[PDB]
Subunit: 470 residues, 4 copies
C-alpha cells in the first residue's frame, strides 16, 4: 500500500458535513491537520495553492516509475551504456530528502546539524566506523551546494534511486575501475560529480523538453489522484476568503491537469452544476518561478487563454475576472488581493521553494502537504511498540551511565523502506523533520483535511520554553 | 544589581570541591549548565574558548558606559553637535539582540520569524496599530542586511542606546525637520542609514584606533570580572583533554587581559604556585578573524611573543610548546590538536560568530555564555507569578474562543528593562532565544558552572517529537 | 554584387602557383593580406581555424534572409502579430557592429570612444541636434552591457535589420502608443528592452532548437561558399606546421559542413586523390565554447565519431590520430600540439570571441577574416575621389579656422548601405575598425589570401611613434 | 638633472605674453602640448584638475626618497629585519609602469599586448632565453590582477624600487633559502605575494596614517614645485570657461598644498593683488574617490572649511560661492557647472584613475600630465642618433630576410635608467605609451604649456587610416 493508495481511498469517500461526523473524522491521524505553531483560521483572508503534489497528487509508484524510465532513456540516448535499460524503479529504496555527495558518490541521510544517519554507496549501506574514512567527523556542511545536492522534492524520488543504480552499476561493471571520486575507463574518467550533473540535466530535460507531461496527460486516471471533495473545500474557502493558484507550471499543462481534477458530473457538491476549474480562483498565476517569486520575481505577464501563449508586454492593469497571470512576484498576489502576508495561508509541497521561502521572505502562514505521511502514519501507529522500546532503551542507557539500540533502530527503520522514515532514523530526527517543524505552521498528508474543521477553528500548539524557563 | 555584580559575587566564592556540595550547588539555577541537546562530557577531548565576555567578562554598566562615552566623543570629534556630550549611558534601556531599521530609524525586537514584538522610535514606544503604517505585515525580512542591523553582541549594547539617543535628539532639536527616512537641516539631509553608519564606524574606531583598550587595561579591577576559580576549572579541563584559546583580539591586548585574569598569589588552587596564563593552554591563537575563521580563515602566522609583532612568513611548522599563533582557521585547531569537531566543546559569547558558525560549518559542540542570564534568572524566578498568570490567560483566551494579556505582558517585560527580556516579550520568544536553543548545545550565565559537574557527566535533554508523533 | 559573390568568383578560379603569378596576384587589394603588426610567417608553427564565416562562408544575402525568416516565424509562433510575416530581409540596411540601445530603441553606429556617428529609430535617421535630447553628450558608455548590445557578428545581421523593422512597425501601428522606452497597448507595455530580449532569444532558438541548420545542410550550394583552393592551402600549411580546428558548433553539423567544403573529385590539387576533411587537421575540437575557451574553458571530452555523441567521461589521454575533442580550453591546444601562443596563427571571424580574446588572454597571433571587405574594397577604390575630397575639406576647414563636409560624408556613406561602411562614417573610424587595428595582427576578406604568399613571408607594418617622438 | 629640476627651471621663468614669443616658445618640445586626437580649445567650457603631480608636482628624487624611507621604517616597525634600514632610494632604477609578478617576484616591463620587454629579479636582469622558464610565451595576462600589480603612478616609484631591494636582500641573505615563489626561513615561508602585500599596505599606511603628509607640508620648498605662472594660466582659463578641482586628497591637505602653490606677493600677474587659491575655482571637490567617482561615486557632502570636517548630512543644495564639496560623482560636476563631457578638459596625472576612466566612462576630453617627459624629452633629442640607427637596423634586417640591434637597444635604454624609457624599450612601445596614445587627447610634461597657446587654438592630429585604406 503506497501513500497515494491511501490518499485515493480517502478521496473516493463522499463528504459527510454533519458537524459531529466531521469532529469524529478529524480525530483520526489520517484526516488530521497537525500544528507546529498556533493559527486562527478566522484571520486567514486568502488561501493559496501550488498545483503539483498538492492539488495534483501524482500516483505512486506509477508516476515515479514513468519519470525514472524516461530519465534512463534520455541518458542512454546521450551515450550511457545500454545496460541502464535493465534498471527498474523500486519505490522501497528511496526516501525523500537524502543528500547526494558528488565527491564520493554517496547518498546520505542527515539530521538538522549535518550529522550522518545513513550512508549508502550504490546499494551498499556503510556502517559507522567505515564512514569515518570519508567523513572524519560523521558530518557534512549542507550549505556547500557545489558538493552536496539535497533531494528534497517528490520529483527527486526517481533520480534518488537512479543515482544509486548508476553507482552500483559502474562499481560492478568490469569495464570500469572504481576510484575514490569516480570511475576510470581507460583514457576516460567519469567523476560522480559529472555523473550527477548528467542525471540532473536528464531529469530536467524529461520534464521540460521530453515526453513526461505528454505521457501524463494522456492517461490521467493512471497518474493523478482525483477527489470529488476538492471543489467542495475550495468553494468553502471562497465563502470566507479569496483563493489563488501560483504554480511553476505553464498554462497549457495547468489547464489540462486542473480540468481533469474538476472533471465530475457535478460542482462543489453532488447534484450541483459543474463549474470550470478557473471559477474556483480569484487569482490564477502560472510560470511563477518560485522560489525567486518570493523575492524580486519576474515581470508580470498576461496569458492569452485562447492560445496558451503570453500576450505581448508587461501587464500593468488591475485584477480582472477571467485574466490569467504569468510570472510576477508574491507582491503581485498581495497587491491584487489586498492581502498582507499573515492574511495568507499558502499550501504547498516544496519544503524549500514553497514553505521555507514564503515564511522567511514574506511572513506568510504555511501549510505543508506531505504525501508520504498518508502511509508513514500507518507505519508509525502500527509499529509504535518498536519506537516505545527505543525510547526506553535510550532512557535506560542514559541512567545506566547499545547493540540492542542499533538493532531496534534498524528494525524500526526498515518498516519505512531501505532509507527509513522521512522524519527520523530511530530516535534521531532528519533535517527534513526539523524543517517541517520550523517552517510549516500546519502540515498534513493532504490539504483536504482542512475540510473537516469549522470556518473559525483555532489550531493550537503548546508554547516553547527554554531549558532555564522550565 | 547588574548581571556582572551577580557574576562577581559568585566569582568571589572559593571552590568547595566536595562532591555533595557540588551536586547541591549545580542544582541552583544560577550555577547550573542548561541543556538544549544531550552532551556526554566524556567524549569531549578539547575545550576551546574565546576571551571577550567569556573569560574576560567586562563589568556592567561601567564598561558599556566607557564605550558609550568614547563613541560619543568620537562622533563629536568628527562633526556631530555638542549636545551629544550631554547624553549619559543608561543600562535600563537596551536589551541585546534588537534590530536597527536603517530605513525608518526604529529599534525592533523580533521573534524568530521576523514578527515585531516591540518597536521604538527614539524613546517613543510605538503601539501595534501605529507600527502597521511602516510595517504593514508587522514583519521584517531579517536577511535584508542592507536595511537591518542586528545588535547581537554585548559590545553592541552602547550603540543600541546611542542610536535611540540620537533619533530622540534630532527629532526634538528645533534646528532639524523630521522626515520619514531621516532629518533635514536646510540643504543637508541626514538619513537614518548614514547616521547608523557613522555610529557603527565610531564604535569600530573606538575599539581599534581609539582609547578603549588603553582605558580598560589601566583600570582592570573596575572593568573586568575576576574569579580565582578560573585556573582551577582550566587545570581540571587540561587533566582530561586539551585546552585552546581562539580570540579575535591581538596578542598584546590578550596578554594584558589574561595576565590580569590569572593574577592571584596562587595557581589552580590556593596554596599552589602561580603559573603564567599561557601554561593553561595547549594552543593559543589570536587575530582569529571569526567567523571567517570557520571557513577558509587567513594564513597561519606566528607571534613573536617578545615583541608582540608577527614573525615574517606563513608558519608551516608543528605545534610547539610556547608558540603563539595568529590567524589560521578552525582546521588549524583540529589538525594541531588531532581533534574532530564533535571532540571539541567551544565556549563563547557570540551567538553568531562563535556558536552558530562553529556548529553549522564544522559540527563543533557548543557552550554559549550569556552574561545577562546571571540577572535574568533572578527576575524570572522572582516574577514567575506574572508569567504563570500570562500562561493561564493564554489558555483561557484560547478555550473561550485581551487587554489583560497586554497589561501583564507589559508589567512582566518592564522588570527586565525598557526593551524586555533578552529571551521573550511576554509569551513570545525572541529571535535570540530561538538561536540559543537551535545552536547552543549547552548554555549558562558563566562557563565557570562546568566546575560543578563531574568529569564524565552526561548532560541530557528530552528528545523532540513532531506533532504527528505525539 | 554582394561580398559573397566576390568571394565565390575568386573561389571559382584555380590556383596558379607560379611564383610570379602569385606575387602579381597578392598585389591586388582583393587578394591581399593586410598587416596591422609585423608577423614572420616562418615563426608560425600552428595554424588554427574556426569554421563559421571563416572556412564556411555563408552566402549573402540568402543566408541572412533565411535566418531572418525563421526568426520572424519564431516570434510570430510565440505571439507577436501576424504583420511580422510581411517583413522581408533587406541587405542594404544593416551594417555589422551597430549598437542597439535597449532603453530608447535606437540602432547606433559609434566610434572607438562611444561617440555617436549615426542614430536610427526604426528607419528614421536622427540628425545630430535631435540626438542630443536622448544623448546629451552624443556619447554612450559601451560597457553598460545591461543597456547596450553590440551586434558584432555576421549572425547578428538579420536581427540588426529585424530590430529596426519591429521599432518601425510598432511606431506606425495604430493599435500601439509610442512612449520613450517602449510601446503601450492598453494594459500591456512592451519596452524596447523586452522586445530586444525576445529577438535575441528567437535568434538563439533558430540556431540551436529551430530548423536553420537543417535548412542549411539540405541546400549547401545555395548557402555556403565553396573553394577548391581550400584543401590546397591547408595541405601547404600542414607541410610547414600543424593545423587545428576549434569551433563552437557540434560535431554532426561540423561534419556535414566540412564534408561539403571538401567535396571535390580531387584532394589538395586537381588530379590528386580525394581525402576526408579530418585528414587536413592535426587536432579537431568542437563545442569549443569560445570565448570561455580562452579562460578556464570546460572539461575535455571525446566525440564518438560513429554516433556523433560524447563518450562518457573526461578525456585524460594523449593526442591520437582520428580522435575528435569537445570542450576543453586553449591550453588543450597548446599542450597537445606542443605550442606556445606566439607559435599559433589563429584565423577567425569573431572580432571579440575569436580575435580579441585569443590575443588578450593568450598572446596568440591573429588573422581576422572580414567577409564584407571583399565588397567594401570595391566601393573604397571606386569612390576614392569622395574620400579624397573629404580629406581636403577637413584640411581646408582646419586651416581656415561644413555643410559640404556633411553632404560628402552622406554621399560616401550611402555607397556602402544605409548604415555606411563597416569601418567608418566619413572621416571618423568606427569602433569595429579600431578593434580590427588593435587586435587583428593580419586581416583579409578571406584567409585563402595566405595561399599567395611564400612559406617564410615577413608581413611588415610600420612602427608606431608617439607625437613627441616624431 | 631630474625631471622636476627641468620643471622648476621653467617654472622660475616669468611669462612673456607677447604673441610672437608665445608661438616661438610653444615650438620647443619642452613647452609644447602634444596631440593624439584633435581638440578645438574653443569648444572647451570647463577646465578640471586633480592636485597631486598635476598642480602640486612633487620634487624628484627628494619626495620619492621620503616616501621610500617612511615605507621602509614602517616595514621595520611591523617586524621586517633591521637591514632594511640600510637601503637608500635610487632614482636611476625605477621606471614608472612596471608590473610586479607576485608569483615569481619579478618586475616586468611589457608592451600593450603583455609581451615581456624587460624582466628583473631583484637587481638581476634576466635575458630572453632564461625568462622562458617562468614565462613560456614571454607573455603575461595583464588582467590577472590577483597575480600582477601595475605600478602606474608616480606614488608607486618608491615601492617599485623597494620591491627590487627586498627581493635582492632576501635572495642574498644567508638566513633565508630562495624558492620559486618566495623565501623559506625554517618553519616560516614568505611568498613574494605576501611580501608585496606588506609593501602595498605600508605605502598606503605612510600616506594616510603615517607622517608623509606632515613631513611634506613642513618643508614645501624642498618637496613641491612652485610656479608663479600657475595663477596666470588659471585666471586665463576662468576668462573663457569654468574651472574645477577634483582631488582624492582631503580638504586640510589640499588647503595647505594649494595655499603654498599660490603663495606669491602677487595674484595672476606680478603687480596684481594676491587672491586666495579657492577664488580660482568655480567648483572645489575633495575626497573624490576616483576612479569610482566616474561611476556611481559616493554621497555628496559639504566641507566645513572653518574646521576641515564634513558637515552632517548629504548636501542637496545648489552650487554656492565659497562652498567646498566632498565625494559626489562626475555627474555632480556636470550638473553644477551645466556641462557635458565633451565640454570638459580634464587635466590629470593618473593614466588610469584620471584619464582612462573619464574618457571611457564619461567621454570627457583629457590632458595627461607626464612629469618625467620634462627630462625624457632631453634624452630623446640628445640621443636621437641611437634611435635613428635602431630604425635603420630594423629596416635593414627586414629586407635582408641582430646582436647589433640588441646592443643599440641596451645602450639607448640605459640613457633613461636601468628600466629604460617610460615609453619604450628600443623600438618596442610600452603598455604605458599605448595607453597615453589611446586615452590622452593631449599630453605634456606640464599643463602649464597650455599658457602658450591662444584662447581658440585648434590642436590637430593626423587622421588614422587602416592598412587597406592606404
Amino acid at each position: 500500500t503506497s501513500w497515494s493508495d491511501r490518499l485515493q481511498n480517502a478521496a473516493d469517500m463522499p463528504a459527510n458535513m454533519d458537524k459531529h461526523a466531521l469532529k469524529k473524522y478529524r480525530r483520526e491521524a489520517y484526516h488530521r491537520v497537525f500544528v507546529n505553531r498556533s493559527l486562527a483560521m478566522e484571520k486567514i483572508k486568502c488561501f493559496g495553492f501550488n498545483m503539483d503534489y498538492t492539488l495534483a497528487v501524482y500516483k505512486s509508484p506509477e508516476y515515479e516509475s514513468l519519470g525514472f524510465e524516461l530519465t534512463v532513456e534520455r541518458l542512454v540516448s546521450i551515450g550511457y551504456p545500454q545496460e541502464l535499460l535493465s534498471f527498474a524503479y523500486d519505490s522501497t529504496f528511496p526516501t525523500r530528502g537524502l543528500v547526494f555527495d558528488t565527491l564520493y558518490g554517496n547518498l546520505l541521510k542527515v539530521d538538522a546539524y549535518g550529522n550522518l544517519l545513513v550512508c549508502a554507496h550504490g546499494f551498499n549501506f556503510i556502517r559507522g566506523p567505515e564512514t569515518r574514512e570519508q567523513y572524519p567527523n560523521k558530518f557534512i556542511q549542507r550549505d556547500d551546494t557545489e558538493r552536496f545536492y539535497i533531494l528534497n522534492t517528490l520529483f527527486n524520488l526517481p533520480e534518488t534511486y537512479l543515482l544509486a543504480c548508476l553507482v552500483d552499476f559502474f562499481t560492478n561493471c568490469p569495464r570500469y575501475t572504481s576510484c575514490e571520486t569516480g570511475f576510470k575507463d581507460g583514457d576516460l574518467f567519469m567523476s560522480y560529480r559529472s555523473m550527477f550533473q548528467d542525471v540532473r540535466d536528464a531529469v530536467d530535460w524529461v520534464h521540460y523538453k521530453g515526453s513526461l507531461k505528454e505521457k501524463t496527460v494522456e492517461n490521467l486516471e493512471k497518474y493523478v489522484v482525483k477527489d470529488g471533495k476538492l471543489p467542495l473545500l475550495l468553494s468553502r474557502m471562497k465563502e470566507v476568503g479569496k483563493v489563488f493558484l501560483a504554480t511553476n507550471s505553464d498554462y497549457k499543462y495547468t489547464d489540462k491537469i486542473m480540468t481533469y481534477l474538476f472533471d465530475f458530473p457535478h460542482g462543489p457538491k453532488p447534484g450541483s452544476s459543474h463549474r470550470p476549474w478557473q471559477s474556483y480562483f480569484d487569482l490564477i498565476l502560472v510560470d511563477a518561478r518560485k522560489p525567486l517569486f518570493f523575492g524580486e520575481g519576474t515581470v508580470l505577464r498576461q496569458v492569452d487563454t485562447k492560445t496558451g501563449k503570453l500576450k505581448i508586454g508587461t501587464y500593468t492593469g488591475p485584477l480582472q475576472h477571467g485574466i490569467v497571470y504569468s510570472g510576477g512576484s508574491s507582491d503581485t498576489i498581495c497587491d491584487l488581493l489586498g492581502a498582507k502576508g499573515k492574511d495568507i495561508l499558502y499550501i504547498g509541497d516544496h519544503i524549500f521553494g514553497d514553505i521555507l521561502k514564503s515564511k522567511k521572505r514574506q511572513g506568510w502562514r504555511t501549510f505543508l502537504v506531505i504525501p508520504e505521511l498518508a502511509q508513514e502514519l500507518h507505519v508509525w501507529t502500527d509499529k509504535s511498540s518498536l519506537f516505545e522500546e527505543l525510547q526506553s532503551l535510550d532512557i535506560f542507557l542514559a541512567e545506566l551511565y547499545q547493540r540492542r539500540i542499533k538493532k531496534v533502530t534498524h528494525d524500526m527503520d526498515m518498516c519505512y523502506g531501505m532509507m527509513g522514515s522521512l522524519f527520523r532514523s530511530g530516535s534521531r530526527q532528519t533535517l527534513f523533520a526539523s524543517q517541517v517543524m520550523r517552517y510549516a505552521d500546519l502540515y498534513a498528508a493532504s490539504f483536504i483535511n482542512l475540510l473537516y474543521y469549522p470556518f473559525s477553528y483555532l489550531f493550537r500548539a503548546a508554547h516553547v520554553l527554554m531549558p532555564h524557563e522550565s
